[PDB]
Amino acid sequence: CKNFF
Amino acid sequence: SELDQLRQEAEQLKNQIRDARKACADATLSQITNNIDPVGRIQMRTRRTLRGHLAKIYAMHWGTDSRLLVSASQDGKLIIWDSYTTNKVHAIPLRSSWVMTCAYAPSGNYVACGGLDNICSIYNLKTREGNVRVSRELAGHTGYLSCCRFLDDNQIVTSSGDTTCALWDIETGQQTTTFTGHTGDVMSLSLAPDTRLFVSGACDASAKLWDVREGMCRQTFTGHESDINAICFFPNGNAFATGSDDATCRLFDLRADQELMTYSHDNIICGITSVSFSKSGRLLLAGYDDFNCNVWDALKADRAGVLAGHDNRVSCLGVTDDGMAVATGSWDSFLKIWN
Amino acid sequence: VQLVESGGGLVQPGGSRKLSCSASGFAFSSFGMHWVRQAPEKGLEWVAYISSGSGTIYYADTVKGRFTISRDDPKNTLFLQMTSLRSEDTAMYYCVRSIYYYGSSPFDFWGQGTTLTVSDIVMTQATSSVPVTPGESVSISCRSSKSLLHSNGNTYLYWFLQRPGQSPQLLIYRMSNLASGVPDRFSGSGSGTAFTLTISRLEAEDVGVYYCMQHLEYPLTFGAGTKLEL
Amino acid sequence: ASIAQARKLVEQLKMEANIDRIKVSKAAADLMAYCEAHAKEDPLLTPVPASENPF
Amino acid sequence: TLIPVFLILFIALVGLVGNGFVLWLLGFRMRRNAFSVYVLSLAGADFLFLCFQIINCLVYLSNFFCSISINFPSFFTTVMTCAYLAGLSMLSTVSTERCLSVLWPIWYRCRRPRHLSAVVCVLLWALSLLLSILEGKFCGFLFSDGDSGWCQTFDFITAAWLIFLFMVLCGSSLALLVRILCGSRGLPLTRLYLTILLTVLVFLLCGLPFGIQWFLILWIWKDSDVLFCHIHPVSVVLSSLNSSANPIIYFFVGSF
Amino acid sequence: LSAEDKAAVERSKMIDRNLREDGEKAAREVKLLLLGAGESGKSTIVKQMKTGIVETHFTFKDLHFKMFDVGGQRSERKKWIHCFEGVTAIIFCVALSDYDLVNRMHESMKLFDSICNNKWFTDTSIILFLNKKDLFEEKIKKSPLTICYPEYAGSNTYEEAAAYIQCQFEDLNKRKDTKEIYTHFTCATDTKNVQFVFDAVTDVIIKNNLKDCGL
Ligand SMILES: CC(C)CCC[C@@H](C)[C@H]1CC[C@H]2[C@@H]3CC=C4C[C@@H](O)CC[C@]4(C)[C@H]3CC[C@]12C
Numbered sequence A: 001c002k003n004f005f
Numbered sequence B: 001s002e003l004d005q006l007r008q009e010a011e012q013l014k015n016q017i018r019d020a021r022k023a024c025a026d027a028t029l030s031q032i033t034n035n036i037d038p039v040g041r042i043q044m045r046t047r048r049t050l051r052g053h054l055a056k057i058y059a060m061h062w063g064t065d066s067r068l069l070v071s072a073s074q075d076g077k078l079i080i081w082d083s084y085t086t087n088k089v090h091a092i093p094l095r096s097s098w099v100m101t102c103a104y105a106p107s108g109n110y111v112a113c114g115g116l117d118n119i120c121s122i123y124n125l126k127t128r129e130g131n132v133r134v135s136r137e138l139a140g141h142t143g144y145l146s147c148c149r150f151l152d153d154n155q156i157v158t159s160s161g162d163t164t165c166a167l168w169d170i171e172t173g174q175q176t177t178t179f180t181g182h183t184g185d186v187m188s189l190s191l192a193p194d195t196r197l198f199v200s201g202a203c204d205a206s207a208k209l210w211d212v213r214e215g216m217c218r219q220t221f222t223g224h225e226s227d228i229n230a231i232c233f234f235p236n237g238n239a240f241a242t243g244s245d246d247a248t249c250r251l252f253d254l255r256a257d258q259e260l261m262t263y264s265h266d267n268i269i270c271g272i273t274s275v276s277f278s279k280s281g282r283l284l285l286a287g288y289d290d291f292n293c294n295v296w297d298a299l300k301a302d303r304a305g306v307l308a309g310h311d312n313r314v315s316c317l318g319v320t321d322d323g324m325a326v327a328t329g330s331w332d333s334f335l336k337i338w339n
Numbered sequence C: 001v002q003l004v005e006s007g008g009g010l011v012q013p014g015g016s017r018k019l020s021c022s023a024s025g026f027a028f029s030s031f032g033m034h035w036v037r038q039a040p041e042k043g044l045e046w047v048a049y050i051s052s053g054s055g056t057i058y059y060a061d062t063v064k065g066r067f068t069i070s071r072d073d074p075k076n077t078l079f080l081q082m083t084s085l086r087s088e089d090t091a092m093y094y095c096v097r098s099i100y101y102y103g104s105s106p107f108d109f110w111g112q113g114t115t116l117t118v119s120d121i122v123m124t125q126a127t128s129s130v131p132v133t134p135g136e137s138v139s140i141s142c143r144s145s146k147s148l149l150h151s152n153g154n155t156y157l158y159w160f161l162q163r164p165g166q167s168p169q170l171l172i173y174r175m176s177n178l179a180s181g182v183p184d185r186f187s188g189s190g191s192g193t194a195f196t197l198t199i200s201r202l203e204a205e206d207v208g209v210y211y212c213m214q215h216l217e218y219p220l221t222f223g224a225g226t227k228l229e230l
Numbered sequence D: 001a002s003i004a005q006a007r008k009l010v011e012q013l014k015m016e017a018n019i020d021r022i023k024v025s026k027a028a029a030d031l032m033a034y035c036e037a038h039a040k041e042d043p044l045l046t047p048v049p050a051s052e053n054p055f
Numbered sequence E: 001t002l003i004p005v006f007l008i009l010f011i012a013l014v015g016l017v018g019n020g021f022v023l024w025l026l027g028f029r030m031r032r033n034a035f036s037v038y039v040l041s042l043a044g045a046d047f048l049f050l051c052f053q054i055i056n057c058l059v060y061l062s063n064f065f066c067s068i069s070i071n072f073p074s075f076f077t078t079v080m081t082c083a084y085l086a087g088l089s090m091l092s093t094v095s096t097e098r099c100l101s102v103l104w105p106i107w108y109r110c111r112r113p114r115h116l117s118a119v120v121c122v123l124l125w126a127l128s129l130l131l132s133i134l135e136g137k138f139c140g141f142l143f144s145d146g147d148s149g150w151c152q153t154f155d156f157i158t159a160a161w162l163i164f165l166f167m168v169l170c171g172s173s174l175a176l177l178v179r180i181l182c183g184s185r186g187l188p189l190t191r192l193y194l195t196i197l198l199t200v201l202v203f204l205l206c207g208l209p210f211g212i213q214w215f216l217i218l219w220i221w222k223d224s225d226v227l228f229c230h231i232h233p234v235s236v237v238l239s240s241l242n243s244s245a246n247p248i249i250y251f252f253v254g255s256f
Numbered sequence F: 001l002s003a004e005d006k007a008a009v010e011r012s013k014m015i016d017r018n019l020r021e022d023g024e025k026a027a028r029e030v031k032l033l034l035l036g037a038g039e040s041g042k043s044t045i046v047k048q049m050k051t052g053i054v055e056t057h058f059t060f061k062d063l064h065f066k067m068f069d070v071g072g073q074r075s076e077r078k079k080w081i082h083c084f085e086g087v088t089a090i091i092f093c094v095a096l097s098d099y100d101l102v103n104r105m106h107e108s109m110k111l112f113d114s115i116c117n118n119k120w121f122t123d124t125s126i127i128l129f130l131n132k133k134d135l136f137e138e139k140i141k142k143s144p145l146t147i148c149y150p151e152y153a154g155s156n157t158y159e160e161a162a163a164y165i166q167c168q169f170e171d172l173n174k175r176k177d178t179k180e181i182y183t184h185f186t187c188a189t190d191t192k193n194v195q196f197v198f199d200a201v202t203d204v205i206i207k208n209n210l211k212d213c214g215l
Helices: B002-023 D002-017 D024-037 E003-029 E034-065 E076-103 E105-111 E116-139 E148-183 E189-215 E226-255 F003-027 F042-049 F104-116 F133-142 F160-170 F192-212
Strands: B046-050 B057-062 B068-073 B077-082 B087-093 B099-104 B110-115 B121-124 B133-136 B145-150 B155-160 B165-169 B175-179 B186-191 B197-202 B206-211 B217-222 B228-233 B239-244 B248-253 B259-264 B272-276 B283-288 B293-297 B303-307 B314-319 B326-330 B335-338 C002-006 C009-011 C016-024 C032-038 C044-050 C057-059 C067-072 C077-083 C092-098 C114-118 C129-131 C138-143 C157-162 C168-173 C186-191 C194-199 C208-214 C226-229 F030-034 F054-059 F064-069 F092-095 F126-131 F181-185
Touching: B002 D002, B057 B110, B057 B326, B068 B099, B068 B110, B077 B110, B077 F003, B087 F003, B110 B145, B110 B155, B155 B186, B197 B228, B217 D002, B228 B283, B239 B272, B239 B283, B248 B272, B248 B283, B259 D024, B283 B303, B283 B314, B283 B326, C002 C092, C016 C092, C016 C114, C032 C077, C044 C067, C044 C077, C044 C208, C057 C067, C157 C186, C168 C186, C194 C208, E003 E034, E003 E226, E034 E076, E034 E116, E034 E226, E076 E105, E076 E116, E076 E148, E076 E189, E076 E226, E076 F192, E105 F192, E116 E148, E148 E189, E189 E226, F030 F042, F030 F192, F042 F054, F042 F064, F042 F126, F042 F192, F092 F104, F104 F160, F126 F160, F126 F192, F133 F160, F160 F181, F181 F192
Parallel strands: B057 B099, B057 B314, B099 B145, B145 B186, B186 B228, B228 B272, B272 B314, C009 C114, C129 C226, F030 F064, F092 F126, F126 F181
Antiparallel strands: B046 B335, B057 B068, B068 B077, B077 B087, B099 B110, B110 B121, B121 B133, B145 B155, B155 B165, B165 B175, B186 B197, B197 B206, B206 B217, B228 B239, B239 B248, B248 B259, B272 B283, B283 B293, B293 B303, B314 B326, B326 B335, C002 C016, C016 C077, C032 C044, C032 C092, C044 C057, C067 C077, C092 C114, C138 C194, C157 C168, C157 C208, C186 C194, C208 C226, F054 F064
């Protein structure tokens, strides 16, 4: 996950 | 100075004329229609919006079958519409872009537009070659053509900015009668239903009653302050309404020979560009520079409706011979059709 | 106006042939043009239609895929491209001008016809041949197989007269309206799917075969043909 | 010159002066009669249903 | 952390309704310019970004009050990244076309193709979509998982494209200013240069910083605890301010 | 829709296409309006750029112009001057030689004051041509300019006189900020005319390019 937006 | 004595003769003659008109003014139209029931609010809404022009629409005319209408804009095009379908059956490119009037023939065969080119060119629509082509160029006016109206396929009465109206023959191209007497330049014109006579209006603030059969002015109507932009007979053929820059529409009788009534509001200050009646003439519509058409009860002087759809000056409006709908054209390049 | 056609002659079956019709004296870009053939012992049968601007193309089901219609706006020339032909295409191909706005008269002009030799609302003519007295009121009736009265108020029935050796001409369009160039003695009326063509005060050089055409929807179909014989 | 124009203008006003005008009451009642006789077939005085409205 | 999300709720709804009826007006109603195609595409990008932020705001509100815990499909944030990047790209294209209108006036009047605006909108949205869908494959927002470095290098490609968009908008704006200051006389130039200064200020400190904090700060600053509670909500608050403020300057102010 | 009504819709669609193409051709051209009083050198101007309204086409530096010599018709102009609402520039020819001839220069100021402050032309720039300047270069010394202009402080030869006529024409507009006036003293054998027209239309074209771009 890049950042779980 | 003998011409000064002639002018005093003219002065006492107009005084005798307004005495003769004053002697028959026993009552007003307003007190007669004080008894009649008002029609209330006419809630008209736009049925169709015709969107093909790209410049200011200066004129429009309905066909006699109440479905085709011609509209002439300043983009060098007059377009003939199918008003039920919003379909363009003919786009006609004009010789000069500066058009100010357009007409539709009662036979449906021709349209005739004119303007700053001083020529009310006549276009044949029912051609064997299938394109719309110019059939006759009517030169002879020395001022801008403000209104040209068809009597038949072969006769057309035109109003121009050279203070004269002219009746033409389309086959020769030579004007057969000239209607002189307006001192200012003639802006509006409307034929009677029997088309044996017509009325016109100029910057004299006067309306004149011309006969097409003989060719002189029998009646002159006065009571506006400025130029009248608009004129339209009552459907009986015995009265007409005149819209001016005074924010006053005024109705005149032929047979009683005076102004009857004024369609004015305090909240209107801009000029009237177009007037028309209904089928019965109970209500007259009027386009304004306040971008909206005002529906007036033509008998009770009350504003029966407001048609506020246009984004610019309502320059042309007309009501069908069926009386079904009112098309209004305007300077924001749209025809709206109201019912 | 005038339309001239070429491209007939003897063609082997299974081959290809191109016919060409060139306009002369009308604004050919503004007209939707058709092709109608006619077998040498059979009435008219519509083939193709390319619209004005070439935006819309239809075909008959018996030519779909084998025939190609295309026009050319600057050269003012309509041409039809065929391939894989057969003896059912042995006909005489007429190229028809038409235009479609309100008040128009489609199918008003026809080309002169070129003989070609290869080595669905059905319209029914009630009687294929009627006797003729010169000066008698003759009623010619056409029977449809659908209600041709559309909801817009129109009734797309067209009447044609094929004089012997001369091309079909539009007589009455939309069941009621006289075309330009017919006498006022021609008259047509009717109702939904029931039509008649009344010819009062019959004149000489008016005999021939009469054709009723539907135009409610494509493919346009013709009557079998009502011959008028003295 | 302006004398001939004033002469024909005086002739025009002489032709305008002899018009057998009717009273305003009678022409007003004629407008009454025309607007009452044709009020039925006026689709602007009376709004009409959507069956007989082509717009 | 909460009242940032309530503030972005307010800004995002008012921007949603304003940009929505802009998108209706010049979408179907009103006759359009070639410029209005750019305003339309900016409105579409901005509509997508604003509604997706409204949905994420509802996700936070539901998972703080009702505790429904909606694991929202992360397919959509690829489309959100495309919408944000397309909005900034179209804003730079607006500035470039204004510069080309003044620098080459007779060309812009006569010889500009009428469908050049459409093909710039289409090709620019296609570039933004391809970039975002590649980031979605390469990072793991989509259904396919993705490695960490090969995420971050093309994410730096996205950030380099963004700073290039800022350089293009700045160069077009400064070329427009120098062309106005050396050769303009019929113009109301005060309102003009305040409008260009306002839109470069918006694209700097209202439209960049969410892209800055989402596309380069997470791989450069890297503390993972201080910035989350403070920077990340306020950054998308500023981009929601850009989102709400675009229809006023681009479409609304001119129309009214 | 039936078949014929669908083909009528298609015919109207092609008519829409041709209308859009012809309005796009006429949207990218420049429409100028000649004016001025009678015999003020206007015909010489339209000769050197090249019944009713007279129209002139010329393309200069890939820019199609349409000139409109409307002054051939003698009617009250308030009823057709709104036809030319939306022209790009208004070429105004004033004869410098008509200062002493008869209040003809005062008639030119009357017409300039009428249309420069007209309600339909509150935004349109005006190109103002001062031709017959060589005729002015002889008739400065035969008769002074005080007979035309009542004050005219400090009379001289050709330089403060021409500048005074320039300054007396230029301040006639009551709103000097919405619209802008251009001026050119010109000869009969020179290419500065259509060059100046191009370079004065170009500012209006820039302003219209910014109006089209929401600015
Ligand atoms: C190529 C694919 C990815 C484009 C899809 C992007 C979607 C979201 C939408 C949003 C707004 C849309 C644009 C709205 C306006 C027009 C103007 C028209 O004259 C050409 C199409 C064009 C330019 C549309 C193209 C597609 C578009 C940019």
